[PDB]
Coordinates of C-alpha atoms in Angstrom, one line a residue:
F1 CA -16.0 6.9 -11.3
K2 CA -14.6 3.6 -12.7
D3 CA -11.3 5.8 -13.6
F4 CA -10.2 8.0 -10.7
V5 CA -9.6 4.8 -8.4
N6 CA -6.7 5.6 -6.1
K7 CA -6.8 9.6 -7.2
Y8 CA -7.1 11.8 -4.4
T9 CA -5.9 14.7 -6.1
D10 CA -7.5 14.5 -9.4
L11 CA -10.7 13.8 -8.5
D12 CA -10.8 16.4 -6.1
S13 CA -10.0 18.6 -9.0
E14 CA -12.5 17.1 -11.1
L15 CA -15.0 17.9 -8.5
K16 CA -13.8 21.2 -8.3
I17 CA -14.7 22.4 -11.4
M18 CA -18.0 20.1 -11.2
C19 CA -19.0 22.4 -9.0
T20 CA -17.4 26.0 -9.9
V21 CA -20.4 25.7 -13.4
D22 CA -22.6 27.6 -10.9
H23 CA -21.3 29.9 -8.8
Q24 CA -25.1 29.5 -6.3
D25 CA -22.9 26.9 -5.1
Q26 CA -20.5 27.3 -2.5
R27 CA -20.1 24.4 0.1
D28 CA -17.6 22.1 1.1
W29 CA -19.1 18.8 0.3
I30 CA -16.7 17.7 -1.6
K31 CA -14.3 17.4 0.9
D32 CA -16.1 14.5 3.0
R33 CA -17.8 13.2 -0.9
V34 CA -14.4 12.1 -2.7
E35 CA -14.1 10.3 1.3
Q36 CA -17.1 8.7 0.6
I37 CA -16.8 8.1 -2.7
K38 CA -13.1 6.3 -2.5
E39 CA -14.5 4.3 0.8
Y40 CA -16.8 2.9 -1.2
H41 CA -13.8 2.3 -3.8
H42 CA -11.7 0.9 -1.2
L43 CA -14.9 -1.6 -0.3
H44 CA -14.6 -3.1 -3.8
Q45 CA -10.5 -3.4 -3.6
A46 CA -11.2 -5.7 0.0
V47 CA -13.8 -7.5 -2.0
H48 CA -11.1 -8.8 -4.9
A49 CA -8.7 -8.9 -2.0
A50 CA -11.0 -10.9 0.3
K51 CA -11.7 -13.5 -2.3
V52 CA -8.3 -13.5 -3.4
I53 CA -7.7 -14.7 0.4
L54 CA -10.1 -17.3 0.1
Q55 CA -8.9 -19.1 -3.2
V56 CA -5.1 -18.9 -0.7
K57 CA -6.8 -20.5 2.2
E58 CA -8.7 -23.2 -0.3
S59 CA -5.0 -24.1 -2.2
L60 CA -3.0 -24.0 1.0
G61 CA -5.2 -26.4 2.4
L62 CA -5.8 -23.9 5.1
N63 CA -7.9 -24.9 8.0
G64 CA -10.1 -22.8 10.6
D65 CA -13.1 -21.3 9.2
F66 CA -13.0 -17.8 8.2
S67 CA -15.9 -15.8 8.3
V68 CA -14.7 -12.7 9.0
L69 CA -14.6 -12.5 5.5
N70 CA -18.0 -13.6 4.5
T71 CA -19.3 -10.5 5.9
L72 CA -17.5 -8.8 2.4
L73 CA -19.1 -11.8 0.6
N74 CA -21.9 -10.7 1.4
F75 CA -21.4 -7.5 0.5
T76 CA -20.3 -8.7 -3.2
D77 CA -23.5 -11.4 -3.7
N78 CA -25.4 -8.3 -3.3
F79 CA -24.1 -6.5 -6.2
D80 CA -27.8 -6.7 -8.5
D81 CA -29.0 -5.7 -4.6
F82 CA -27.5 -2.6 -4.1
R83 CA -27.3 -1.0 -7.7
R84 CA -30.3 1.0 -6.8
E85 CA -28.5 2.2 -3.1
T86 CA -27.1 5.6 -2.2
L87 CA -23.1 6.0 -1.3
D88 CA -25.1 6.6 2.7
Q89 CA -26.5 3.2 2.8
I90 CA -24.7 0.4 4.9
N91 CA -22.9 0.1 7.3
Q92 CA -18.6 -0.7 7.2
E93 CA -17.3 -3.4 8.7
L94 CA -13.6 -4.2 6.9
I95 CA -11.5 -1.5 8.7
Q96 CA -10.1 -3.9 11.7
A97 CA -7.6 -6.3 8.8
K98 CA -9.1 -6.4 5.6
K99 CA -8.4 -2.8 4.7
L100 CA -5.8 -1.1 6.6
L101 CA -1.7 -2.9 6.4
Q102 CA -2.9 -5.7 4.4
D103 CA -4.0 -4.3 1.0
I104 CA -2.1 -2.2 0.4
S105 CA -1.8 -0.1 -3.4
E106 CA -3.5 -4.1 -4.6
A107 CA 0.4 -5.3 -4.1
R108 CA 0.4 -6.6 -0.8
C109 CA -2.9 -9.0 -2.4
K110 CA -1.5 -9.5 -5.9
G111 CA 1.6 -10.9 -3.1
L112 CA -1.0 -13.3 -2.7
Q113 CA -2.2 -13.3 -6.2
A114 CA 1.2 -15.2 -6.2
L115 CA 0.8 -17.6 -3.8
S116 CA -2.8 -18.5 -5.2
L117 CA -4.5 -20.8 -7.7
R118 CA -0.6 -22.1 -7.8
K119 CA -0.9 -24.9 -6.4
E120 CA 1.5 -27.9 -7.4
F121 CA 4.6 -25.5 -6.3
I122 CA 3.7 -25.0 -3.2
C123 CA 3.2 -29.5 -3.0
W124 CA 6.6 -29.5 -4.3
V125 CA 8.4 -27.4 -2.2
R126 CA 6.6 -28.8 0.9
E127 CA 7.2 -31.9 -0.6
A128 CA 11.1 -32.3 -1.5
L129 CA 12.4 -29.0 0.8
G130 CA 11.3 -29.1 4.5
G131 CA 13.1 -26.5 5.7
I132 CA 14.6 -23.5 5.2
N133 CA 17.9 -24.5 6.3
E134 CA 18.0 -26.8 3.1
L135 CA 17.2 -24.2 0.9
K136 CA 21.6 -23.6 0.6
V137 CA 21.6 -27.1 0.0
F138 CA 19.3 -27.1 -2.8
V139 CA 20.5 -24.5 -4.2
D140 CA 24.0 -25.5 -3.8
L141 CA 22.9 -28.2 -5.4
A142 CA 20.9 -26.4 -8.2
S143 CA 24.0 -23.9 -9.0
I144 CA 26.7 -26.5 -10.5
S145 CA 23.7 -28.4 -12.9
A146 CA 21.7 -24.8 -13.6
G147 CA 24.1 -24.3 -16.6
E148 CA 26.3 -20.9 -16.8
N149 CA 24.0 -18.5 -19.6
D150 CA 23.1 -15.8 -17.8
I151 CA 19.4 -16.6 -17.9
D152 CA 19.8 -20.3 -16.5
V153 CA 21.4 -18.9 -13.4
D154 CA 19.2 -16.4 -12.5
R155 CA 16.4 -19.3 -12.0
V156 CA 18.9 -20.5 -9.1
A157 CA 18.6 -16.9 -7.8
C158 CA 14.7 -16.3 -7.6
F159 CA 13.9 -19.5 -6.1
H160 CA 16.0 -18.5 -3.3
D161 CA 14.4 -15.6 -3.0
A162 CA 10.9 -16.0 -3.5
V163 CA 11.0 -19.5 -1.3
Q164 CA 12.9 -17.4 1.6
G165 CA 10.6 -14.7 1.1
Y166 CA 7.7 -16.8 1.5
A167 CA 9.2 -18.6 5.0
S168 CA 5.4 -17.8 6.8
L169 CA 3.4 -19.0 4.4
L170 CA 5.2 -22.3 3.1
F171 CA 7.0 -24.3 5.4
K172 CA 5.9 -23.3 9.1
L173 CA 1.8 -22.9 9.0
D174 CA 0.1 -25.6 10.9
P175 CA -3.7 -25.4 9.0
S176 CA -5.6 -24.7 12.5
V177 CA -5.0 -21.1 12.9
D178 CA -7.8 -18.3 12.6
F179 CA -8.9 -15.2 10.5
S180 CA -7.1 -12.9 13.0
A181 CA -4.3 -15.7 13.5
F182 CA -3.8 -15.4 9.7
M183 CA -4.0 -12.1 9.3
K184 CA -1.0 -11.7 12.3
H185 CA 0.7 -14.1 10.4
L186 CA 0.6 -12.3 6.8
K187 CA 2.2 -9.6 8.7
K188 CA 5.8 -11.3 8.6
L189 CA 5.8 -11.6 5.0
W190 CA 4.4 -8.3 4.9
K191 CA 7.7 -6.9 6.6
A192 CA 9.6 -8.6 3.4
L193 CA 7.8 -7.1 0.7
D194 CA 8.4 -4.2 1.2
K195 CA 12.8 -5.0 1.2
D196 CA 12.0 -6.6 -2.3
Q197 CA 8.9 -6.0 -4.2
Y198 CA 9.7 -8.6 -7.5
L199 CA 9.3 -11.2 -4.7
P200 CA 5.6 -12.1 -6.0
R201 CA 6.8 -12.0 -10.0
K202 CA 9.8 -14.2 -8.7
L203 CA 7.7 -17.1 -7.1
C204 CA 5.5 -16.5 -10.4
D205 CA 8.2 -17.2 -12.4
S206 CA 9.4 -20.1 -10.1
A207 CA 6.1 -21.6 -10.2
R208 CA 6.2 -22.0 -14.0
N209 CA 9.6 -23.7 -13.7
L210 CA 8.1 -26.6 -12.4
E211 CA 9.4 -29.6 -14.9
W212 CA 12.8 -28.4 -13.5
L213 CA 12.6 -28.1 -10.0
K214 CA 11.9 -31.8 -10.5
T215 CA 15.4 -32.6 -11.7
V216 CA 17.8 -31.1 -8.8
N217 CA 17.9 -33.7 -7.0

């Protein structure tokens, strides 16, 4: 079941066909087996998200010694140790903040992957842009020099959206928060990632335009 990822009804129907091969068994174990397998899939997904957030911390210059994700790192370094284990083997210590309302549909995880490894853009946007109020001045200055071509003028709007949608993590973030504080703060980016779902792509497109962003000044 590497193919049934994030598929409830399809997996349910597949297991119904699986159980209908022999008429002696008519039990309803499927209702719990599908939830168990999907919990395992969610554990793997939150492992990937834990790696993503570790990269985000190490790239944003954050401090606070996140240690709750160390148990997910332990869950993902026993890949060769739990390979012979059962589906009901070990506890789950991830529903607190690292499974619900932070890793939805693996898109918000990609939302953080946008602010992942690419780092020089963060340094430049902190050094040259001090506050949010300077964004309007910067975009006004950049529009007159971008060049009206319908592809060179969307670069000053993608930047304006990707910076104004990342104000929580870019400008005002003291490198002293803990895991709980960081997860509560991320629910300020999560409430803007739904208004426009192309924020990670906007940031990734404004990141490659780093040899031109250092020209407006």
